[PDB]
UniProtKB/Swiss-Prot annotation:
Miscellaneous comment as given in the Swiss-Prot or TrEMBL entry: MDM2 RING finger mutations that failed to ubiquitinate p53 in vitro did not target p53 for degradation when expressed in cells.
Linked pathology: Seems to be amplified in certain tumors (including soft tissue sarcomas, osteosarcomas and gliomas). A higher frequency of splice variants lacking p53 binding domain sequences was found in late-stage and high-grade ovarian and bladder carcinomas. Four of the splice variants show loss of p53 binding.
Gene of this entry: MDM2
Family label: Belongs to the MDM2/MDM4 family.
Role description: E3 ubiquitin-protein ligase that mediates ubiquitination of p53/TP53, leading to its degradation by the proteasome. Inhibits p53/TP53- and p73/TP73-mediated cell cycle arrest and apoptosis by binding its transcriptional activation domain. Also acts as a ubiquitin ligase E3 toward itself and ARRB1. Permits the nuclear export of p53/TP53. Promotes proteasome-dependent ubiquitin-independent degradation of retinoblastoma RB1 protein. Inhibits DAXX-mediated apoptosis by inducing its ubiquitination and degradation. Component of the TRIM28/KAP1-MDM2-p53/TP53 complex involved in stabilizing p53/TP53.
Protein's name in the database: E3 ubiquitin-protein ligase Mdm2
Known partners and oligomeric status: Interacts with p53/TP53, TP73/p73, RBL5 and RP11. Binds specifically to RNA. Can interact with RB1, E1A-associated protein EP300 and the E2F1 transcription factor. Forms a ternary complex with p53/TP53 and WWOX. Interacts with CDKN2AIP, RFWD3, USP7, PYHIN1, and RBBP6. Interacts with ARRB1 and ARRB2. Interacts with PSMA3. Found in a trimeric complex with MDM2, MDM4 and USP2. Interacts with USP2 (via N-terminus and C-terminus). Interacts with MDM4. Part of a complex with MDM2, DAXX, RASSF1 and USP7. Part of a complex with DAXX, MDM2 and USP7. Interacts directly with DAXX and USP7. (Microbial infection) Interacts with herpes virus 8 protein v-IRF4.
Residue intervals of the SWIB/MDM2 domain: 8-91
Taxonomic source organism: Homo sapiens
Effect on the protein upon substituting residue 40 to A: No effect on its ability to induce apoptosis
Induction info: By DNA damage.
Sufficient to promote the mitochondrial pathway of apoptosis, as annotated region: 1-83
Localization: Nucleus, Nucleoplasm; Cytoplasm; Nucleus, Nucleolus; Nucleus
Region of interest (Necessary for interaction with USP2), residue spans: 1-92
């Protein structure tokens, strides 16, 4: 992943906007740096991820699972994560 990806400007679709508003101030347009931070905070605050979970995020009974279309995923597959995120936003 190039560092430049973090500067991408994005407009979240409603379901992503719903999640983002649960952990941070509502903007219409974000950087990817912002979207990633807020998703990370959503995950951690809801303890969907911990050390000794084998790098797995568990999100089956959750808004995140709806967004991502998976019951769980590895925090190690960065490319796959970006893909799951982009299906819920529009680039600016
Ligand atoms: C920010 C974030 C968001 C989401 Cl959805 C998942 C993981 C993270 C985050 C993360 C965590 C906790 C915050 C859940 N633990 N390990 C990692 C990791 O590598 N992360 C990460 C950072 C930059 C780009 C990508 Cl692609 C990442 F997947």
């Amino acid at each position: 992943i190039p560092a430049s990806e973090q500067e991408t400007l994005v407009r979240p679709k409603p379901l992503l906007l719903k999640l983002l508003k649960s952990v941070g101030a509502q903007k219409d347009t974000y950087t990817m740096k912002e979207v990633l931070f807020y998703l990370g905070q959503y995950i951690m605050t809801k303890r969907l991820y911990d050390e000794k979970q084998q790098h797995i995020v568990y999100c089956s009974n959750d808004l995140l699972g709806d967004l991502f279309g998976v019951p769980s995923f590895s925090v190690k597959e960065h490319r796959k994560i970006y893909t799951m995120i982009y299906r819920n936003l529009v680039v600016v």
